Amino acid sequence: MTDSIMQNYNQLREQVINGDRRFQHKDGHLCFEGVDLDALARQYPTPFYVFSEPEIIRNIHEIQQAFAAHKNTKTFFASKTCSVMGVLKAIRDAGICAEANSQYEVRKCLEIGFRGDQIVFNGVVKKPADLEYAIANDLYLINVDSLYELEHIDAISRKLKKVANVCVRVEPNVPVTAFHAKSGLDLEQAEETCRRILAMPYVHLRGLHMHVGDQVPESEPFAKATKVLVDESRRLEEVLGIKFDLINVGGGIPVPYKYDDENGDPLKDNMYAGITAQDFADAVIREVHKWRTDVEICIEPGRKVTGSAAVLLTEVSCEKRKTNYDLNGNVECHVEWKFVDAGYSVLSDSQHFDWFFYVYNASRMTAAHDAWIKLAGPLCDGGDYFHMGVKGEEFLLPKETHVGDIVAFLDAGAYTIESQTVYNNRPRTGVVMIDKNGDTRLIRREDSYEDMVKYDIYL
Amino acid sequence: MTDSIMQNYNQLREQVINGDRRFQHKDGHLCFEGVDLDALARQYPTPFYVFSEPEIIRNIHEIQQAFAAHKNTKTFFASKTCSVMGVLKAIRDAGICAEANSQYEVRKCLEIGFRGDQIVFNGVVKKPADLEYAIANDLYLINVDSLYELEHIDAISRKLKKVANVCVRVEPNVPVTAFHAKSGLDLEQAEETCRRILAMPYVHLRGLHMHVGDQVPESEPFAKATKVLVDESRRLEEVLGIKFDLINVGGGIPVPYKYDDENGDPLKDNMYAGITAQDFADAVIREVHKWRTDVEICIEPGRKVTGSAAVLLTEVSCEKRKTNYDLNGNVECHVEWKFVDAGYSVLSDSQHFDWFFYVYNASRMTAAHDAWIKLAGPLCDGGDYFHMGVKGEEFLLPKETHVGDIVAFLDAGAYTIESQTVYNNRPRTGVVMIDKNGDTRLIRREDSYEDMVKYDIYL
User: Fold this and answer.
1) Could you tell me the domains of chain B?
2) Nearest residue on chain B to A456, alpha-carbon basis
3) Between B147, B320, B457, which is nearest A443 by CB?
């Protein structure tokens, strides 16, 4: 019933401001770590993202606590999730390490203060220049994704006379893997890869690596895939006469994007998180301890560290009513369009990956969200409106919603910044940080006009 | 039959190098306007786009020739399609005008040499600062998209004491329009909007505006929608006692992305262009001439100007074979993966809009493309491979294809540059131009490391 959906959404709204560790209300406005978000959006031009260092810390503590029973566990934040320097600084200051996915990501992590022995470099295309930069900076791990890439690692480590620390990435076939997974080696190739590495003077084999996927909604895939990696690690220790330093089990811990679990099925709608960080650790640690309790476990969480820790703030900038009439002139329906100053060039996954984010009127957060509306962006593009609504393509906002109100998208902290574009020559957004003491500062400027022509060469 | 698909694709390959106005072959390499693309990709680091000024001129001449029977026709390139300054310069030098979709797009068009009276500014979200910039620079047209926006235009034109030239955008319901079209006013609102404008001292009503869509595969939608705009233009001249300057019919002329029309259905697969520029003009001019033969017709083509006029060049940077085995150890299939140094962060529409682009080995363009392969990008993301293949997700390349070969994506000139991202901190690409004399120059640099941290604020 449309009634039950509206009631349910407003119960969720009341829970945001009365039972959520991240949020409060003051003067009718949504607050984030004590910061009035209506007022904040009057200090900085919209649209912009605002991150919470407190929530990043909470997410890291959840992950670390999940692995308490295995003392030798190292956590590497997957920086492709978000690499604004102030966010990386917060993750460093919380005490964990960094995973990097290109040459420039390695360099950024070094610049912001991660030591080489706190960085893992992963990739399917690591060119000689990428490998030379990584080996020169003594990284904790460089993953081996293919036999072709291993030839370069051998040649370059010999040239630099510096040891390359490596893990061999294996992708288990856990019921297509050949046809759908570009990453890693087949299980059948792990032994010959490790044998080749053991003969190289300046390459050090540290263990095996896998990564099963993103926003994973059940625990058995981590468990079955971890068992495969563990069984092969055990067998290679015996066959090759060695003892591995570590096993790297990757990332994939999901984040709740819809919270009413009683009303969802994570296997049909993975906006419902199927599992928790504790379920992930329970799967990994149990399978590893069938082999060794002392070996180091490496994990590479991305989404879980930052996903819940940002909000997108965007101003209602225009409004219109459209009306469909039949042939006799009678009204078929009214459509209430609200236009915000952020579109899919700002929030890419709302279009390209059918991703749901909670939407509320932050200026009227204690008011009933009782009007069905369609929410559009500012791009000159018929497709730039938000399709992932509360009911179909329709959202709920207070009927009193006014141009100038601030709209908030929740859970906007993962894969939302580096994926922005300058389509229509609208600038990529500023980013604000709420630090752990509750104070705010700008950590990324909005693209300026100059920024957008400076790459071009012209008279 | 898989046989017939392979034969057909190689007939298309032979047509590229023996019957295409854009391309030739030399020393086994694909050439573009006489430029060896293998050699060009050794001068500039891949991946990069290369545009052809000759082909841009050819596309403009097609459009202009299509409208020969209506002398008073003005052509505005939709710059959201591609706004690299060197591409805008080529379009200016070919003699047409410019359509702009944000404040910064207006400013760019002015900077590269378009006069104010050569610029149309369109948008659903034109804030006071956007309107003030536009009115101050005496633009040919600012479109009116909503009653709310018209209040700002009246106030700001009075403040500046400068006339704002406007067209009223109407979106016809041509069999949902209320529910799926965010842009424009209802037909029923056109009269009251025009009446309001006629009473404003510093606003000048020039006519009505529509835009039906992108890559439109039949002519009847342009014809029915144009008739609606024409019938309302006629009626308002009578009711209001005026004579319009113009009628603006927008863009939407399609580009062929698959060329074997004998084997396609444009209504099921709009990679087949359903119509030509001449079909578009035939629809528009016939409907307009039922009202007036002297009125100015404005058109706003985007894709058609640049789509066919660029190639994406990317190096084969890694290779691997993956193999699926059954429970008895026998081989089910081999999968040959080829990795190029461009992924969906470089060519966005290949993922987000299921767009097809022809793919060939430019280093081996005269060789049979006889091996089924899967083509992957460099991003640390399981989804970063090209899904829109020759047969399903599979592409055809010569079996001899080697790391270091240059792969070309054809028809890569529309909506491909401003949509790039810095995901994984891989840089947005350089862009090269072949000028009308056949010589090459860099017109956009590749993003540098510095470029990618300079927006951030950190210690």
Assistant:
1) 2-52+308-453 (2.40.37.10), 54-306 (3.20.20.10)
2) B444
3) B457
